[PDB]
Every structure is written in C-alpha cells, then in structure tokens.
Amino acid sequence: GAYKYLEELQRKKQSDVLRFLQRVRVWEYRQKNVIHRAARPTRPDKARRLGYKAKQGFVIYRVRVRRGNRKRPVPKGATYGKPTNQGVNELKYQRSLRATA
Amino acid sequence: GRVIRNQRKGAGSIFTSHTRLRQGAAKLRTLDYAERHGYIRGIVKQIVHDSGRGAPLAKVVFRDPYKYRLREEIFIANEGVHTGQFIYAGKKASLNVGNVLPLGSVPEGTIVSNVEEKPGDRGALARASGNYVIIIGHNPDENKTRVRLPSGAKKVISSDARGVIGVIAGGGRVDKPLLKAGRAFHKYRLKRNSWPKTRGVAMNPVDHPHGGGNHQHIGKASTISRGAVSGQKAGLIAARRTGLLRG
Amino acid sequence: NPLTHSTPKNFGIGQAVQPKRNLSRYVKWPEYVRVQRQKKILSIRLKVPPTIAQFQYTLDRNTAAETFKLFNKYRPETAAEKKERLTKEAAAVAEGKSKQDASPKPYAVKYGLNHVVALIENKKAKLVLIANDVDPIELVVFLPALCKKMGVPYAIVKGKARLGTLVNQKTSAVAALTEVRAEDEAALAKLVSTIDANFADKYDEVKKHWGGGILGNKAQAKMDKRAKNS
Amino acid sequence: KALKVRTSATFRLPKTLKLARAPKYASKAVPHYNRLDSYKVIEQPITSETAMKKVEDGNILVFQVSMKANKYQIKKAVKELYEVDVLKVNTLVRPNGTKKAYVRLTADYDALDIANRIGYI
RNA sequence: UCAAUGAAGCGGAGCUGGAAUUCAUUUUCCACGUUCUAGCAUUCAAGGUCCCAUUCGGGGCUGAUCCGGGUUGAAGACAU
RNA sequence: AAAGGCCUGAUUUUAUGCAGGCCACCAUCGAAAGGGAAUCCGGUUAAGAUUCCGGAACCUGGAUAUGGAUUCUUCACGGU
C-alpha cells in the first residue's frame, strides 16, 4: 500500500525533493500541447481515490489554464452603467481554475 | 468624445502599407557558414526602383552552396553600386564599395550603411536614402563596436553585426520640395494612408483634444507628458525643449 | 588508364556545391523528441536533491548478470502453465482427496509495489529490486530509506524490461524474492552481501550528498578555459 | 555505438504502411439498384408544333429528361433504348424546370422511322 | 524571454604554413581550397582504395580531420 | 506541425524496398471587365443562335498506324 506513503510525501509539497520534481514538470509541461492524453497518472495515490481505477477504458488528460482573473468583455474597459460596476479588472471568476480545466 | 484620428491609425483597419508594388522584404542575406568563415561572391544582375522607398534596390544573385540553385536576395543600393558588379560579403570580404562586411573586420572611421542591430535581423540601420553610419569606436575585448548613428546616437553593437559598405543611394532625396500637393499625393499614395494630416485646431472639439472654440485656438498646453495615455498624447509629446533649435 | 581522370571537387568557401555531409546534428527533431530529450538534460543541469541520484548510482553489469540469472531460475508461473496446474490440482483435490497441498509450495518472485512493500514492512522480503527510471520517479523515491530503515536488502537496477521479462509482464518497476531454496540460498547470500557493499553501507552519505549540476559541452568546456587561464 | 547518417535537417513524416478498409458489413448493406437507367433518364418526347416542325427537317428528336441527364448518360441511354446509333446529343434546361435534349440521328437512322415506331408521328 | 533558420557546419580536440627561445609538444603564434571580368558549377563526385564473383554490376573508406548529438545567437534570473 | 506526391524498377494492372529521391515546400476560396486552349461564314425559327442546318476550320486529352526523316560513322543537315 505505497499509496499511503505516496500521499504523505505529496502533502509536503514545497519540500526540496518535490520542489525539484515540480521544477522538472513545469518545464516539461509547457512545451507539450495544452491538451494531450497523459499516458498514465502522475499521482497514482490520488488517482485511485479520485475515481481512477487502472483498468481498460480510463484516460488522463493534462491541461494548462491561464492564471489571473477574467477581464471585462467590453472594448477599452468602457463600462457603461452606474459607477458601482465600473471596474473591469480585479473581477473574479466564480468557478475555480479547476472547473475551467 | 469619439475616437481621435491617430487612435484609429493603430487599428490598422485602412492604413496598412500599400504593399502592392513593394519589391519584397528589402533586407540583408542571412548569415551562413560561408560568410561566417570566409566570404561569398554574388552579382547584381540589375537594379529596380523600389516603390515607396527612395533607395533603389541592389537586387543581387547568390549561389546556394548547399542545393544547386541561385538564392535570390535583395540589397539596398549603395552609392557606386552598378549592375554587373560582383558583390563580396562575409568576414573575409575585402572591404570595398558595395560589399557587406561584419562590423568586427571593418577598421575604425569608416562609412557603412544598412546595419544589423543584432546579428540575424538582416540589417535595420540607416536604410533610408542619403543616410549612413560612422564607425567611431572599436571594442574588440567585449565584441562591441561604437558607432555614430544618423540620429546623432551613440550605440554599442555586437562586433558580429554586419553592414554593407557605402552610403545608401538617393542622397539629397529630400532637397527639392514636393513643390505641390499632387506631388506629395503621389508620394504618399504609394506608401501611406497618412496624408493629408489635418490640423487638430480646426476640428470640432469632439474630433480632437485641441479642437473647437469660438476662436481657432489650441487653448491648453501643446506639450503633453509621456505618462499621458492614448487619446491625450496627441500634439506636442514629451517635448524636452520646444522652440527653435540651438537656442 | 587514360580515361579514368582525377578532378578533385573544390568544396571550399564559395566553391562548387558542397556534398551532403551527415546533418544529424541539425535535424528538426519532432517536438516530442525534443521535449523528451532536454528533460534528461534538465534532469542533470539542476542541483539534484539527495534522494534523487540515489538512482543512477547502480549495479554493475557483471553483478547484474547473476542477479538476473538467479531470478530467471525463480521465474513466476504464468497463467498458461496454471491451466494444466489448476487442471491437475482440481483433479487431485476432487478424487485424490489430497486436501489442497497437491501442488508444491510456489517459489516465485514477488512483484508489484504494494505487494512487495507489504513484504517489506513485514520484513518477509528476502531481496528487493527497484527499476531506476520509473515515471514519475515519486513512485519509488521513498523505497530506499524505507528498505534501509528496517534492514531489507534492496538494489536499484537499470531497465524495467529485465524486470518485466522476469515476471512475464511488460514492466514491474519492482521485484522481490521472498523464498529461496537452499541450493540457491548460497548464491543469494553472495548477492545480498555484495549488494550491501554497494548501497547499505554508503546510504548515509547518499542521504547527505547532493547531485546534478552537470554542465553541458559548451558550458563545461568554456568554464574550463576560464579555469585554464585563471 | 553505431549511428545512422541522415541527409535532411528537416524531418518529414516517415512513410508508413496504410491498410485499406476491411468493413465487417457493407455500409449500405446492399448495392443500391440503378439510380438512373434508360427509362429513368428519358421521360417523354415533346410534340409541340416547333418540335413537330423541327423533327423531319432536322433529323433530330427532342427528349424530356431528368435534371441529372448528362450527355454521356443520355447518348448511351437512347442508343441502348431505341437500338439506334446517335450522331450527337444537344441539350438545354427549359425554363419550366425540364431538361430538353435535342438528340440527332446518324445517316442510316432517320427520325421518322424512329419516331413512328414510338407511337407519335 | 527575444530573434532566426530548409534549424548546415557550433564548441572542443586536431592536421598544414607562418614568426616566436618548451623550438615545433595546441608552453606560444594566426589562417585552414575563391578578389581584373554579367561564364558554369546539379547525378549517393571523380580519382584512389578495399570487398563481392562483379554480367556487361554493385557495395564500403579516404577524398571532405575527429569527439561531443545543446540548431544558432542575444539576454537572463532581469525582464515578462 | 512528424502537414508527400510525385518518384519508379519488381515481367506491358510489377514489391505499396532501400533502388537513376527530389523543392522543404504548406488546405481552399476571392475577378460573368484582370490572365485565359481552340471558330468562322452563309442559311435558318413566332421567338434561339460564334449554340440549330450546311460548309470549312482549330484545340485538349487519348490511344494509335502509314508516309518522310535518321541510323552499320548510333540519336540530321546548309550557311564565314
């Protein structure tokens, strides 16, 4: 049951060893396509608890999404309306970057 | 207030360069193994008057050393460049009129034109007519070179960069005036959708920041900060010192 | 012969068209190849954390020989051989009434990480091998100290293909013998002792040592020149 | 150890064997019967006054035919239908959505002989 | 991060000729087939060489130094 | 961007092989006046015609056979 051990190393995220591995995939992930079938899970411990059972018929995609906030969809930020809603930046997305993915 | 004219210009909706007759991307031949060690010997088959560029194009023919073909390329014609004149270019190119040389090999105090900002850009300096750079410094230890630039600027340049020896032809291209509206009309028709430029004062105040008023007067200050934003920095921009020059 | 004539072709600067030398250095490798390549390059450029590069300090080929040799003796039994094995088992249990021990005690290499791990904290594993290039490496990084902290002899081994073929599978990323017969015991004891010479004694320094930082050909040569003249 | 020698800095797609379709079933499960046969392309000759005028002195017949009636199609169609060699076939699209075909008969076959056996003229 | 390229010759280690006092040894030392001409340069190059059985054809090696497989350059933890 | 479409030999549906292998190119649409493979004349209908009839032309593609050419000096000859 190494997944339990894999879990408790995964908790310690900013740890030096995972900081290294994080620094590996950040480079690796950008160059590959934004959407691409992951060959196999990178976190098998979390894989088997989120629903993935390593049998036929399951697939994994790896996705990247822009950070930051959702800007206004109006030209030149010309908000038309009462000054309560002038703001076109610092306007936050209701879902998380998860659901966007 | 509606959108000022210059603000519309950035949109590129209509003011795209009238590139119908432009002979091509007038630039220098890419840096290759031949030039990077020795030199190459091309020929100016013939020269054509480029559209919308006072400089004629020293259109040259180069032999491809890898596949048997004549890699066509265009040069900007220096002074004294003529058809049937062989062109030598490269770090081992003998310095002569109309020959491209890397700026490391050229000696101090030499006239050069059509210079690369950084190696690979295919030349971006002094391309205009009657303009030339002057090599006023050499800094071999850090592969740098100090030039007098046409705008009176003092650039430092990687010594690997290259420029073609000689001054761009068409000196005095601007001496006699257009002398008439249609003349400038023809000058601009071929190159820009930028003429006429109509004074902002005569505008109704919506059209331009300066416009409007019972008396046709600018009203507020002409000088406008760099820190100002699009739609405000039209007029006199960041004017370090207005008035007559040399005083 | 006055018809065979030597006309050397000048391929010098500005001369006749060059011949097609091998451009293998300049191939526009498909982007997947590239991104796959520099991954190894970045794997070595950066300061590698101590529990990484505990791999890539592995067994020699000669020692790996008898390692794979004795495992090949202890190859597990695939389901194909189980077909007749269950056939004679079912018959012997049914009419021979020989309880369930009609077959001898199976002696196979325990494999699969959760299975081998279970063998480890139970200290019932007599030898463990680890593939040194699992993707992601996270799967095994905890194993060496896990094995070391309770005295089970582990050995990092290069190439999951050898593990897969010794387990009739594709990959295993891990292997373990828990039972060895007496005749093979002496060879196993020789192997365990000589592996313990590799990792078990030195693990403390490896626990403290860093790694990575391998400068490339351009960088390392140039910094030698600065080192050479200064 | 040993490495190959390549010639192109550009790595084109490596040619690879292709397999043609091997369907378990036919997509339509049966070859559709002829969409356009002889009787399907030809509808009925027109005996308007002008066609009546044109037939004898022109050595030609007029053929109401489908929108899909191609000259290649119709030439063999009439040839196989009336057992008559055809010199050339002329066609047009009558403004009432009907493709009229001015079919012309060779020297041996004279329209009236082909016309009368039909039933009209 | 920027730029370019059909990502073509980059770096190192060499060979040849040069002036040096380790004399030549990369203890130095620079360049590695073209500068009177609107020509042409294309057949896995000719040669030389080795092998096959070679039929009346082919195939390897020097020619064309080799090692690193980082395409090259700039910049750089700034900037974005 | 890993974007192949033609090469051609296996024996005249012939390897879907290195083999007499190549730009390294990058889908397509956008003109009834831009460029464009080739037609004219006479007659002829109630209305059509460079389109129908007659006659004489030309072009594209295809397969395809005779004349003439050239060839024992293998793929022409006159003319400064």
Q: CA B187 to CA B175: how far, in whole Å?
A: 15
How many angstroms is C1' of E58 away from CA of B67? 27
Q: Which of B106, B94, B97, B95 is nearest to B161 (CA)?
A: B106
Within an 8 Å CB–CB cutoff, is residue C4 touching chain B? no
Q: Which two tokens stand for residue C198?
A: 């590799």
Contact list in D for residue C27 (CB cut-off 8 A) is 6, 8-11
C26, closest residue in chain D (CA to CA): D9
Closest nt to B160 (CA→C1')?
E73
Asked if the Cβ of residue C30 lies within 7 A of any atom of strand F, the reply is yes
Q: What is the rounded CA–CA span in Å between residue C84 and residue C210?
A: 53
Q: Do C18 and B34 touch (CB under 8 A)?
A: no
Class of domain C30-216: alpha beta
Give the DSSP H/E element, type plus range, for residue B187. Answer: helix B181-189
Alpha helices, DSSP H only, in chain C?
31-45, 61-73, 79-94, 113-121, 138-141, 143-148, 160-166, 182-196, 203-208, 217-229
How far, in Å, CA of B29 to CA of D68, rounded?
58
**For residues C227 and C213, what is the distance between their CA atoms, to the nearest angstrom?**
17
Interface subset of C 8-47, CB within 8 angstroms of B: 12-14, 17-18
Amino acid at the residue B190 = L
* Chain C residues lying within 8 Å of A40, measured CB to CB: 135
Phi-psi region of D13 (alpha: psi -120 to 50; beta: other; left: phi over 0): beta
Q: Determine contact, residues A72/A91, Cβ cutoff 8 Å.
A: yes
Question: In the complex, which subunits touch C with 3 or more CB pairs below 8 angstroms?
Answer: A, B, D
Asked if C171 and C160 count as a contact pair (C-beta separation under 8 A), the reply is yes
Q: C27 vs D4: CB contact, 8 Å cut-off? A: no
Nearest Cβ partner for B68 among C12, C13, C17: C17
Place of tokens 């007496």: C182
HSE-up (13 A, CA, CB side) for residue A36: 12
Tally Cβ neighbours within 10 Å of residue B154.
Answer: 10
Distance CA B28, CA B124 (A): 9
State the maximum Cα–Cα separation within chain D, in Å, rounded to a whole number: 92
Q: C229: which residues sit within 8 A by CB, 6+ positions away?
A: none
Contact C14 B41 (CB under 8 A): yes
Whole-number Å distance between alpha carbons of C7 and C15: 14
DSSP A35-99: EEEESS-S-HHHHHHTT--SSTT--EEEE----S----SSGGG---S-GGG---SS---SS-HHH
C16: nt with nearest C1' to CA: E41
- Subunit contact C17:B39, Cβ cutoff 8 A: no
Q: How far apart are CA B63 and CA B66, in angstroms?
A: 9
Element holding D102 (H helix, E strand): strand D98-105
Q: What are phi and psi of C154, to 5 degrees?
A: -105, 160
Q: Which nucleotide's C1' is closest to C30 (Cα)?
A: F2
Encoding tokens for residue C120?
A: 């480890």
Structural contact between residues A64 and A29, judged by C-beta atoms closer than 8 angstroms: yes
Determination approach: cryo-EM
Q: In angstroms, what CA-CA distances link A27 with A21, B83, C32, C141, C217?
A: 10, 52, 13, 21, 21
* Secondary structure (DSSP) of B19-30: TTS--S---PPP
Which of C207, C208, C217 shows the shortest CA–CA distance to C44? C217
Q: Is the CB of D15 under 7 A from strand F?
A: yes
Nearest-CA residue of chain B relative to C12?
A: B34
> How far, in Å, CA of A48 to CA of A63, rounded?
19
Distance, angstroms, CA D4 to C1' E57? 26
Which tokens belong to C128? 């463990």
User: Which chain C residue is nearest to residue B34, measuring alpha carbons?
Assistant: C13
Interface of C with D (CB under 8 A): 20, 22-24, 26-30
Instruction: Report resolution (Å) to 1 decimal.
Output: 3.9
Residue with tokens 């066509």, as numbered in its chain: B72
Q: Find out whether B13 and B63 touch, Cβ atoms under 8 Å.
A: no
For residue B215, what are the contacts with CB-CB under 8 A and spacing of at least 6?
A: none
Domain assignments of chain C as residue spans, ordered by start: 30-216
